[PDB]
Design a protein around this ligand. Structure first.
Ligand SMILES: *[C@@H]1O[C@H](CO)[C@@H](O[C@@H]2O[C@H](CO)[C@@H](O)[C@H](O)[C@H]2NC(C)=O)[C@H](O)[C@H]1NC(C)=O
Ligand SMILES: *[C@@H]1O[C@H](CO)[C@@H](O[C@@H]2O[C@H](CO)[C@@H](O)[C@H](O)[C@H]2NC(C)=O)[C@H](O)[C@H]1NC(C)=O
Ligand SMILES: *[C@@H]1O[C@H](CO)[C@@H](O[C@@H]2O[C@H](CO)[C@@H](O)[C@H](O)[C@H]2NC(C)=O)[C@H](O)[C@H]1NC(C)=O
Ligand SMILES: *[C@@H]1O[C@H](CO)[C@@H](O[C@@H]2O[C@H](CO)[C@@H](O)[C@H](O)[C@H]2NC(C)=O)[C@H](O)[C@H]1NC(C)=O
Ligand SMILES: *[C@@H]1O[C@H](CO)[C@@H](O[C@@H]2O[C@H](CO)[C@@H](O)[C@H](O)[C@H]2NC(C)=O)[C@H](O)[C@H]1NC(C)=O
Ligand SMILES: *[C@@H]1O[C@H](CO)[C@@H](O)[C@H](O)[C@H]1NC(C)=O
Ligand SMILES: *[C@@H]1O[C@H](CO)[C@@H](O)[C@H](O)[C@H]1NC(C)=O
Ligand SMILES: *[C@@H]1O[C@H](CO)[C@@H](O)[C@H](O)[C@H]1NC(C)=O
Ligand SMILES: *[C@@H]1O[C@H](CO)[C@@H](O)[C@H](O)[C@H]1NC(C)=O
Ligand SMILES: *[C@@H]1O[C@H](CO)[C@@H](O)[C@H](O)[C@H]1NC(C)=O
Ligand SMILES: *[C@@H]1O[C@H](CO)[C@@H](O)[C@H](O)[C@H]1NC(C)=O
Ligand SMILES: *[C@@H]1O[C@H](CO)[C@@H](O)[C@H](O)[C@H]1NC(C)=O
Ligand SMILES: *[C@@H]1O[C@H](CO)[C@@H](O)[C@H](O)[C@H]1NC(C)=O
Ligand SMILES: *[C@@H]1O[C@H](CO)[C@@H](O)[C@H](O)[C@H]1NC(C)=O
Lengths: 401, 116, 186
């Protein structure tokens, strides 16, 4: 049975969206020549198909971001008074000093990261995302999980902590008799987080991949593809249409192949990012807005709550967990029979230190005395494999006098 | 003079021996904003990503200036998106362009000995 | 689009093979037929690739729908905001053309009332904690109630359990527990 416990804050990084780019099709393939455009016009709707795919991807990126972050309708705000029972959320809460309403960690995150090729601005800037994260933090702090099902219900933070321990099989009094200890542990952990961050391979890999693909697409414009020159301006000159047409056709075929390859790779990468964004949205909905009971879904150990923070093209979670620390070997017994009636533990487990017998909860050593309210009777101690002899207090006969 | 893109960006004049820089003419893209042909016929055109000195009501936006629509100081829910936190709608009649609003704002009455 | 890609020359003299087989013998019709073949093969490959990607996306959506059907319908779910907003009660499945529709029945609280609470109550030097409820007070007396629906009961020895003394709990108040045993002793 564990005797002590520790609180550990764990971080997790998830990509959400990628840069939205749109490729000017006829400007890439032919540039600005009229003859090249007329000669390309006789292939079909490849140009339009590519443009439509590249616009669908861009729309889907904003859909992903909106699904991940827009989970609340009312923008809650924390009161100026900061009395959370000793906890210190100053590191993760917005500070008025900074121009943008970004926290001390949301800013440390931001400091760690002719052809026809254009980029498009995101629908949501980096200020609205920060406002969403601040609203989520304020709601979680000041209303618990109640704001994820209806109107916010205010409640003292210490009582919320007590109920969150109650949710994982640890009685309330463990918090109430140790509040300063958990407060200090949580403050030290959240300090160590910012110490360690000052790491983002997942967020950087997508940027590197997109840059590499865009650069390869750019560099594919300097290949002959079997022609005499790699520039259309040297084909339009020094040659008349009748024999310049074949070389222009070769260039057109090469550049169409390059465009199709790039579009296919972009589509596959967009599908992968969509899957990651769906996973991040599920984590935000379940770990943050409520307490989770899925093992190793919101951090290692028993889950308490999570706090969301934004990041460039991604989201960061700070899972607060609960881990037992020190163990003590004990001798146990399945049941105890007093007078031919086998008593089973109501919610605890029977332990003994060598001379006496006690009943305690599983996740934190708190030895109590066996009574008729911690046990329920069933049958006789003749069929249970493991049984011992002991007496139940039965606090009724002393008061009869 | 050449760049990463392997395209010329600097050239020396063969007569005055002076170097010149060359940059592309802005092209961008054209988008049309409409509230549906069933309701009305007025439309607004968005010249994407171009300082509209180049293009021959104007409202400069980060995604490119939008013409044919007015700018208001209010903020409502996003009807149809533009970019960089700006949305347009047919609420007021003409086409208006505003900044999208996240939602209603409320402050939870929180104190250390109050429950609801 | 796949249908319409059949009306493009792809660099030939006509877009119909019946006008290539005529007016020409094989020796110089072969090159134009080759051009048409290359164009149509490219179109077919593009269409097949797009169909494969779309099929993968639909497979993912179908797996999600199967999970929702298995968990929200066949049992009660406790995953927050997985079977509708609010606390989940049950769901009813309905069919649709190439799809499935769920009708999630949920439970949402409506009207609130601000109350003054207390972490614990110590009667005679023994701090009492709520067994499963939360301590509330209307101003003059004290009650214990469940969290999700106001049902004020009276504090007894069966709604509370004792632990320690009211000297280490940060928030504590003074009150008395009924202890329904002494009135019946007479
Ligand atoms: C459980 O572990 C904590 C963490 O070490 C213990 O708290 C320490 O208590 C000693 C004695 O008062 C102090 O000198 C240390 O500074 C405390 N550490 C921290 C981090 O605050 C606690 O005593 C342990 N519980 C038991 C029952 O031994
Ligand atoms: C097992 O725990 C019991 C309960 O604390 C111990 O019994 C107490 O031991 C102390 C130490 O001498 C005495 O002062 C108390 O009077 C004892 N109480 C009772 C009710 O007997 C017991 O000593 C422990 N056994 C071991 C091996 O540690
Ligand atoms: C618990 O106590 C009971 C009664 O005292 C024990 O039952 C007797 O155990 C002795 C031990 O040799 C037997 O000879 C008797 O036949 C048993 N029954 C009766 C009615 O006396 C029981 O063994 C004890 N459990 C233990 C020691 O684990
Ligand atoms: C808080 O609730 C208690 C319990 O209902 C109220 O006490 C009762 O008040 C009514 C109204 O006058 C009396 O008729 C009853 O006799 C009272 N019962 C008891 C046991 O005292 C109390 O008035 C309420 N306080 C407030 C401020 O609403
Ligand atoms: C609850 O009641 C106890 C006992 O009546 C209070 O304890 C005394 O409070 C007075 C208040 O000034 C002190 O002077 C005494 O020293 C305390 N102890 C004793 C043994 O009398 C306790 O303060 C009450 N709790 C409150 C008022 O919140
Ligand atoms: C919280 O942490 C900050 C940062 O170290 C510190 O300045 C402050 O004193 C701490 N306590 C409170 C109540 O803000
Ligand atoms: C308990 O004692 C046994 C007996 O030697 C030993 O094997 C075991 O490691 C001990 N466990 C702990 C947690 O001390
Ligand atoms: C436990 O194992 C020991 C072997 O060391 C055996 O003697 C004893 O009977 C066993 N008891 C139970 C309840 O399994
Ligand atoms: C050409 O002639 C002009 C004037 O006639 C003179 O300024 C210039 O230096 C000459 N050389 C070149 C290379 O232009
Ligand atoms: C067009 O708008 C009118 C008036 O709002 C409405 O009654 C009608 O259903 C809409 N659609 C069509 C097809 O007329
Ligand atoms: C557009 O060009 C004018 C030229 O003076 C400049 O003042 C203005 O800042 C430019 N605006 C943008 C958005 O580039
Ligand atoms: C909008 O605000 C600006 C600056 O605050 C002001 O100059 C302008 O008159 C306002 N317009 C309206 C319609 O209120
Ligand atoms: C309860 O009373 C406080 C005190 O003014 C107030 O701020 C709060 O809004 C009230 N809550 C409700 C639900 O009426
Ligand atoms: C609650 O906050 C008030 C400040 O208005 C303070 O006077 C009181 O001591 C606090 N009580 C607890 C239990 O935190």
């Amino acid at each position: 049975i564990p005797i002590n416990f520790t609180i550990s804050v764990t971080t997790e990084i998830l990509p959400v969206s990628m840069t939205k780019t749109s490729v000017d099709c006829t400007m890439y393939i032919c540039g600005d020549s009229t003859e090249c455009s007329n000669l390309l016009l006789q292939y079909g709707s490849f140009c339009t198909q590519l443009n439509r795919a590249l616009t669908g991807i861009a729309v889907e990126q904003d859909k992903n971001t909106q699904e991940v972050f827009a989970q609340v309708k009312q923008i809650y705000k924390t009161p100026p008074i900061k009395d959370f029972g000793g906890f210190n959320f100053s590191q993760i809460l917005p500070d008025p000093s900074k121009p943008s309403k970004r926290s001390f960690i949301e800013d440390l995150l931001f400091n760690k990261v002719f052809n026809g090729l254009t980029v498009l601005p995101p629908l949501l800037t980096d200020e609205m995302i920060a406002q969403y994260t601040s609203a989520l933090l304020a709601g979680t702090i000041t209303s618990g999980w109640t704001f994820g099902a209806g109107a916010a219900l205010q409640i003292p933070f210490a009582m919320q902590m007590a109920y969150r321990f109650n949710g994982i099989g640890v009685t309330q009094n463990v918090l109430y008799e140790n509040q300063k200890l958990i407060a200090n542990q949580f403050n030290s952990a959240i300090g160590k987080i910012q110490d360690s961050l000052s790491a983002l391979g997942k967020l950087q890999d997508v940027v590197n991949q997109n840059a590499q693909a865009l650069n390869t697409l750019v560099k594919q414009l300097s290949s002959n593809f079997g022609a005499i020159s790699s520039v259309l301006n040297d084909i339009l000159a020094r040659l008349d249409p009748p024999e310049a047409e074949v070389q222009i056709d070769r260039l057109i075929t090469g550049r169409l192949q390059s465009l199709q390859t790039y579009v296919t790779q972009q589509l596959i990468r967009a599908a992968e990012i969509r899957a990651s964004a769906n996973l991040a949205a599920t984590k935000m909905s379940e770990c943050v807005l409520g307490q989770s009971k899925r093992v190793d879904f919101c951090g290692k150990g028993y889950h308490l709550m999570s706090f969301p923070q934004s990041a460039p093209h991604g989201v960061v979670f700070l899972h607060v967990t609960y881990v037992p620390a020190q163990e003590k070997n004990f001798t146990t017994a399945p049941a105890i029979c007093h007078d031919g009636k086998a008593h089973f533990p109501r919610e605890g487990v029977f332990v003994s230190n060598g001379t006496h017998w006690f009943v305690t909860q599983r996740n934190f050593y708190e030895p109590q005395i066996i009574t008729t309210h911690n046990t329920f009777v069933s049958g006789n101690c003749d069929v249970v494999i493991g049984i011992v002899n002991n007496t139940v207090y039965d606090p009724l006969q002393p008061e009869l006098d | 003079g050449r760049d990463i893109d392997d395209t010329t960006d600097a050239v020396r004049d063969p007569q005055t021996l002076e170097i010149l820089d060359i940059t592309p003419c802005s092209f961008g893209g054209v988008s049309v904003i409409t509230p549906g042909t069933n309701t009305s016929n007025q439309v607004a055109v968005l010249y994407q990503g171009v300082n509209c000195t180049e293009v021959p009501n104007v409202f400069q936006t980060r995604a490119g200036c939008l013409i044919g629509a007015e700018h208001v100081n209010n903020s409502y829910e996003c009807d149809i998106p533009i970019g960089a936190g700006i949305c347009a709608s047919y609420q007021t009649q003409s086409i208006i362009a505003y900044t999208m609003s996240l939602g209603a704002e409320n402050s939870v009455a929180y104190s250390n000995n109050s429950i609801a």
